[PDB]
Design a binder for this molecule. Structure first.
Ligand SMILES: O=C(O)[C@H]1CNC[C@@H](O)[C@@H]1O
Ligand SMILES: O=C(O)[C@H]1CNC[C@@H](O)[C@@H]1O
Lengths: 596, 589
């Protein structure tokens, strides 16, 4: 990467100033902004909170559902004392793609809506003056970038996003924005990897800087005491009597990376890390050499009004709920979350399966969204797939570079419900997995979540995985309700087929659930009732517990969340175990009791 | 028919005794009841209310969802004085099909779950003693009887009904049961038809009795005063200064039919009727020679716990709600209702489109759940459909409220096979209806104007459309409106010169789901959808009625698309208005 993914810090060498607040915002349905000079200021803006998704503020459909180009603008005073620094705009994300301007000048563009965008404004920044940032953003969906979908043009020319995925197309500036100042020679990246040696541990590391001066690396314990120190851009820190980062029992050291010229220090980067190992051994997931059974949820970045907008309050409530259920794990379904989620998981000892936004790659869904009105003959995969692969690999590189040093991150999920039953899909995913392994200094477990279409007899992609994640809805989409006994039979039949393959890898259920409307009670239960959610879960548990190789269960979903409206979604997806405002349905206690 | 459809009455000649109450009931999953003497009494019964659907009483899934054979039993004391009367068991209905036994003797069987079953127990009845009735009932769904569906067998032998229709498969004894006594020579049927002559009216009639004795027919006004009298099994009653039965302004005369033996009366049948005419003239629906625009709903027989169980309380609340919306009409979607609904509509001046249970006649839905009219079972289905049609029309023809027959809901209609099938149904209906009143059916969107072969059979055309719900809903609602107008422009271009009535349009709407801007499923979207539909309706002169789907939320089969039944109600299942109810009230005022 031609920029650093490192989270920004404030110290003697590095400065940061938040640009969060009310920005100026303007929709550009006619796509006239750039030729009209909007990069120098929006002509008729409204106010827009940052961070937030824009959609749910408005009271009219066309603004909520807006699809196309739209622009953000703000101004900030740059301290004069930042003069002799490399000055960057850092967006937590720009959803889905955008071009950043500063003081009227084009700085950078980015594709991918869920990872940081770094824009080097050093050459146009005006220290000791007010500066301007303008961002052109686009939220259309296509088949050459993630997540996948289509864009429909309505009779009036109005665009409408048509996802191939089951979540609302929230977009905008959904995460915090900073302007930061770095030393001219700085720490750009580092990687740690761990080895356990009895009571001791080794922290292997690499550091990438933007210069040639010597590097010193120190490790401090949770009290700030020096426990190890070495020199060089590559090395090993030896930690006596190491306090390991444990599941639901975190311990964090602080790594301190210094660039020196002998006379003094040029840069200092510090970050909390946790000494822990993760590996797959047969059907076991080993954390610090001991098996762990994953218990938790797929989540979303989703909350009323804010949409995917980041807020520490959502983090705090969600973790309190997670702990109350006795969970130990979540998957970042279906995109990398704001960095703060991982920082907090590190502190709380939660395990994370970190997922790239490779969702929407199922052919039947694509075809369905094309058949709506209307198309049944024209598709061009041969042309788009190579471009999609490039985008997928780029997002993977960005995710892993951003997240690798979190002790919480124990696995990469490289897809959710793609086509996997052709040799072509194998060749596609082989490249993604190869890239992931190359970018991950730890070479930690890699996986993806498979839809039921990936039958054990047909799937060509599970051998790429270190463990296999299954999304299954036996008792919801398949043989629901009065047919639930048949659902259980079908589920056991499938798992018997997996069993007979004797793959000797762990299986984790990454999704299972039922839409459940809080307050819908029925005796006997019906699909959509709270009681049916409980019974469905009990049936699933009986199945899970029948197979030795099943080593985790992440329910879909932690909480009800927003989707595109339609005949199958009653104000979003109601498969939450909690409501959207984070309160438990009856099924939450079922998990609490089982996971205790 | 070899029995009478006439509603039972109590007078000097006719007696009736209710058998409603707690009956004995037993499921028969192994299908051994008739092999094991159950017709002489159930061996291990539980109690079951009659009238009611059985399903929603139980607390376990297997009892609620029971599909197959199941049995009812009760005992009743027959008064000694009923000796030498013709004694009948009269079930308001037996859902879906069944065999009636009395005192251990097989009496009759019936196919069709929404019309009366008459069982002549004259030869086995024991006057002045306790008597027993046992009924074997079956609620499976097939493609040779209505309504249509399939029956799935789960790997353990357990049956599950798989409807091709969007309502829960409620079954059992859902209507009241009577034992009745009739004279040996009795009035079996009669028919009335009306002609308006200025301020006067003619009531044309025919009477069918079970004997050869003379018949006298009288007409009394609402106060019981004699206004007309004539002799003969066929005749005309002349009514001076007739008080017509009017929309939302009923007036009912009483017809009195006497069989005489010269110096005495052998039988008397009495029923309230209303003098009114209905006809289709060009694009207008004429009631008493004046155009009427139909305003109202499709309903169901559906209420919490009772299921389809009849109760006058449901009738009363529903009619109060209908009146509050300023409605004038409902369709008996998708089966004839209990007779009492029509009696009440007659009193309240509501117009009824009376619908036979010919629903589930779809190939798409059939193929998914399981070329509908090309299947070898079809000749049998046709016979069942015609039988139900004959029964419905014979039962309901003399209600002034009944102004049209709906002979199907959403069948396949785009092949010559379908045309030939429906031609037979319509021909039969015409033979049974003394009034030859308008016949129609409700068409699904698949019946494209360019493809449908069956609309020419209809006196007026009923469309079920969901532009803005199943087609281009939500953010695409402007596209939905364009598509709707495109279709209606295609109908307009045919210049058929017939009225169109929208018999369904609606959106699932969860009470209490509010959103600004609206989303599908919200109360606000229901309002916006309706407003869009009205704009379309009002753009076509030939559109002459709108019946919203549905009056109230109602039970369906469980599934991923039904959140505790169907929520397209304008009212909740307990009969309270969503926001959209006011929209109808204001428009229909
Ligand atoms: O249908 C569902 O509820 C889930 C199915 N698997 C993918 C999820 O994004 C989706 O939300
Ligand atoms: O889908 C619906 O809501 C309706 C479609 N037309 C037929 C109705 O029985 C059904 O309930």
């Amino acid at each position: 990467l031609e920029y650093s993914e490192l989270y920004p810090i404030q110290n003697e060498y590095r400065m940061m100033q938040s640009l969060d607040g009310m920005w100026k915002f303007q929709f550009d349905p006619e796509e006239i902004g750039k030729k009209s000079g909007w990069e120098n200021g929006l002509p008729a803006p409204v106010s827009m909170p940052v961070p937030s998704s824009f959609a749910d503020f408005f009271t009219d459909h066309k603004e909520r559902d807006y699809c196309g180009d739209f622009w953000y603008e703000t101004e900030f005073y740059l301290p004069a004392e930042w003069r002799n620094k490399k000055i960057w705009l850092r967006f937590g994300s720009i959803t889905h793609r955008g071009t950043v301007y500063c003081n009227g000048m084009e700085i950078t563009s980015h594709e991918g809506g869920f990872l940081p965008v770094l824009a080097d404004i050093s050459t146009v920044a005006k220290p000791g003056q007010v500066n301007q940032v303008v961002v052109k953003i686009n939220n259309e969906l296509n088949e050459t970038s993630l997540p996948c979908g289509a864009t429909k043009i309505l009779n009036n020319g109005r665009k409408l996003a048509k996802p191939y995925f089951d979540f609302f197309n929230y977009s905008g500036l959904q995460r915090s924005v900073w302007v930061i100042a770095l030393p001219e020679e700085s720490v750009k990246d580092y990687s740690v990897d761990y080895e356990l040696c009895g009571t001791d541990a080794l922290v292997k590391y690499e550091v990438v800087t933007t210069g040639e001066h010597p590097v010193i690396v120190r490790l401090l314990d949770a009290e700030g005491e020096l426990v190890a120190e070495t020199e060089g851009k590559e090395g090993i820190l030896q930690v006596a009597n190491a306090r390991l980062w444990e599941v639901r029992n975190a311990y964090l050291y602080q790594i301190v990376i210094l660039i020196t010229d002998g006379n003094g220090v040029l840069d200092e980067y510090r970050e909390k890390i946790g000494i822990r190992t993760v590996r797959i051994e047969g059907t076991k997931i080993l954390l610090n050499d001991r098996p762990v059974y994953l218990k938790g949820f797929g989540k979303h970045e989703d909350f009323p009004i804010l949409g995917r907008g980041f807020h520490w309050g959502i983090v705090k409530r969600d973790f309190e709920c997670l702990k109350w259920t006795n969970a130990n794990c979540f998957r970042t379904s279906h995109y990398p979350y704001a960095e703060e989620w991982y920082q907090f998981a590190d502190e709380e000892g939660f395990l994370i399966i970190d997922e790239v936004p490779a969702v929407g790659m199922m052919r039947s869904t694509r075809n369905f969204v094309a058949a709506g009105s209307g198309n049944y003959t024209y598709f061009f995969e041969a042309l788009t797939v190579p471009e999609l692969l490039k985008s997928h690999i780029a997002d993977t590189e960005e995710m892993i570079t951003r997240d690798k040093n979190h002790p919480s991150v124990i696995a990469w999920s490289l897809f959710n419900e793609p086509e996997t039953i052709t040799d072509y899909a194998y060749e596609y995913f082989k490249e993604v997995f190869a890239a992931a392994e190359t970018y991950d200094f730890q070479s930690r477990p890699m996986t993806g979540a498979f839809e039921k279409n990936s039958k054990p007899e047909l799937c060509k992609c599970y051998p790429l995985c270190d463990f296999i994640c299954l999304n299954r809805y036996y008792g919801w989409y398949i043989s629901g309700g009065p047919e639930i006994e048949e659902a259980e039979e079908l589920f056991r039949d499938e798992m018997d087929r997996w069993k007979a393959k004797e793959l000797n890898v762990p299986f984790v259920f990454t999704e299972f659930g039922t839409d459940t409307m809080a307050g819908l009670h029925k005796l006997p239960s019906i699909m959509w009732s709270e009681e049916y959610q409980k019974e469905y879960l009990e049936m699933n548990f009986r199945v899970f517990d029948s197979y030795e190789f099943v080593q985790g269960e992440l329910a879909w979903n932690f909480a009800d969340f927003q989707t595109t409206e339609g005949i199958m979604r009653v104000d979003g997806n109601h498969k939450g175990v909690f409501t959207r405002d984070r309160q438990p349905k009856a099924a939450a206690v079922v998990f609490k009791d089982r996971w205790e």
